[PDB]
Amino acid sequence: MKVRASVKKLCRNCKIVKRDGVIRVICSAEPKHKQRQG
Amino acid sequence: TSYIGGEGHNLQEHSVILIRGGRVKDLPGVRYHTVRGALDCSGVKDRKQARSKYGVKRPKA
Amino acid sequence: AKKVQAYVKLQVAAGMANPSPPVGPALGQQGVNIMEFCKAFNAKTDSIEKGLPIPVVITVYADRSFTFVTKTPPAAVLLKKAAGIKSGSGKPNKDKVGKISRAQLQEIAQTKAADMTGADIEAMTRSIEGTARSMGLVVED
Amino acid sequence: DKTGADLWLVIRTMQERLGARPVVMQLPIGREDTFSGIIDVLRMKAYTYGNDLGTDIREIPIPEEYLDQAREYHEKLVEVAADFDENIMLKYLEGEEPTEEELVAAIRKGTIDLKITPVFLGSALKNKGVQLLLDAVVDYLPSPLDIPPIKGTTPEGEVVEIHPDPNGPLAALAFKIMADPYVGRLTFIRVYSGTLTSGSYVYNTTKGRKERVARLLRMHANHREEVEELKAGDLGAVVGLKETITGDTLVGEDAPRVILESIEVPEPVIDVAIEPKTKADQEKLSQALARLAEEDPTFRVSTHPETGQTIISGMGELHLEIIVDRLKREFKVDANVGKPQVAYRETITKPVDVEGKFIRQTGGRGQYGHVKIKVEPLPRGSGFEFVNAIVGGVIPKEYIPAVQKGIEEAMQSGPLIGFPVVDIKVTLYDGSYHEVDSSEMAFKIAGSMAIKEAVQKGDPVILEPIMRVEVTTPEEYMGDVIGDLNARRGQILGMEPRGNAQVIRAFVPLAEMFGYATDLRSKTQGRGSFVMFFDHYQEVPKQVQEKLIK
RNA sequence: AGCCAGGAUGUUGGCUUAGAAGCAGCCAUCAUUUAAAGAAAGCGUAAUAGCUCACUGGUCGAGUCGGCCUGCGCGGAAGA
User: How far is CA D417 from the centre of its chain?
Assistant: First the structure.
């Protein structure tokens, strides 16, 4: 995944969750769309 | 160094030739001739008279 | 009106009757013949005519040859030999380029006894009027 | 016996891939790790293997179960064999079993026609299905007689079959030379007619030479059997002969000095730049092919007609690769191995017009020549066109030849890198002269100046070579095939299907086109092949302009 | 929002098209039949593609969508 200060939904299948206390992007269709540290 | 006699020869870098004794008093430091029709050397295209020099086969008549 | 299993469309005319250059090998490469193609092909192609672009069915199962019941030509195939240009576009909207009409391609649209949506032959009338305007023509309708 | 070893799976392919009509001839007892015995349908007998050393075998009847599975496949076999012998057809429908002898005749009379392909099996490492495959041999494998006669040509010129009669003219082909330490040069040959004889005399028409065959020889899997003759259809090696290289046709020493066919045409696919370091090695290399080109005419050597460097024609990576070991080792030559150069071209964009002056008046052979021209670019693929545009004759008649040989000339070293400035039209529309000073030559310079500058001025452009290529590929791989080609500075042109495959045409730069074999065979796991032709020259993307300033 | 459904006609769309049949490219972005289906949404075939979409039916049954003004917080935050 990419880890970075501005996390965004990229494709329409990114979802933005927050877990523990950390904004992340999940994306069913795009491993590359995975994100952290938002 | 060596003369390539005749009109038109298909010789180049790397061509293995054979060469005989025969200077060319006109070009300096040319004391040998290239034996046309020998190893890589070609007979001369189209020749008719004096073929044996210049390496050319009696044209299928 | 059933499901998937056998159909290609990739020709040059009823003129050329099985060529290998602009098509050829994969004119039949699964259950169809690079050779069969003036047989079920020219089962009527040269009875009537060889001079208009038209593909056709393949209907494939496992019975030697095929049952591709054949049929119609496109609608800019009759913008070369019935309406206008032999290639066409050029600079398509840089001006009016070419120009057709209403008469121009009525009985030319009007023939097909096999394809078109609706008994209203005023509706499937202007149904083909834009295959000529997919190139950028003028409407002398 | 190896994991995944599924017999059917093959046949489920031998008709799915190539698509022939194979015929199950056996059914294995114990798929893979449980490899025990095997069964031959045709003869409904069962054999077994107790080990893998190839000793404890035996023909033990079917083991309880299985059995049933057989029948049906032994029926289809006979049902198959039916499409050959009507006798094994009726007897089928009537309820009689074809004789184990007429049954074989069908299969055999059927294979030999390239209609069917008898499939067998067995772990060759564990010695299984081998002794049964060997029967499979004779039983279905053609004899030198069941095969169609070789064609050859008389000294006059006319085709003609070569009959396998060990009493007609002597006609044999050669196919493999080998240096034996004990008997020397060996020339394995396949006879077709007549019969070669130990201690005779032959004649190779190919290289019009009288060879003296002294000893005949047959290679036994473990010793040198010295026989006395090879009758048509038989194979072995002769000892003697010196001028007989590959593909040579040897006839009697009086027989019709004929030459068989042999014509095989496997050209190349991959080449490399080979620069023999200091002129020293440039020689070791000459000898390199002087013997390597006889020991393998499956390649070609060429001196790039434009830049010394020599090309090494191969037939696949590995090929040239392993030559690079021997040619560098068993020849100790140590040169360079990079890639070919590209035959670029110079030219211009904008038309220009400049003065061509020369004059040197000090006191005698004045040297006075001067001309003005009209330089104008021409379509990429125009050529060379000059214009004798002189009115009354301000530039004498006798000097124009030379003012051209000057312009024509200068165009040799481009204004950018030094390449054949081409694709332009030139117009001589002016220029004066002197009664005494002018010279045929003085003009050849002036004109060679007018040009030497119009190109410098009309904004030059480094043109390059574009090729025509046609990759034959199953539209299975196609998808990426086209891609890869796009990401190669190339622009696609079409794909009109062929056979089960499909052809792709398009242009590309010879620079971004090197070692394409091992890239095409990549996007196609082997099912890919291409050709290539020249076409035209065309500008470099500017970014490649300052690139070439080398 | 799920879910069960449909996803078309000129049109395989004319086209500097080697092959395109929506797709870097072609231009415009019009044009037939329907419940409604884009000369175009997609991961993307050797091309026919197989498979999901924007858009429409059924199901279900009361809420749902996201701009603005403001409070407190969250990530962005590594040193001997």
Answer: 35
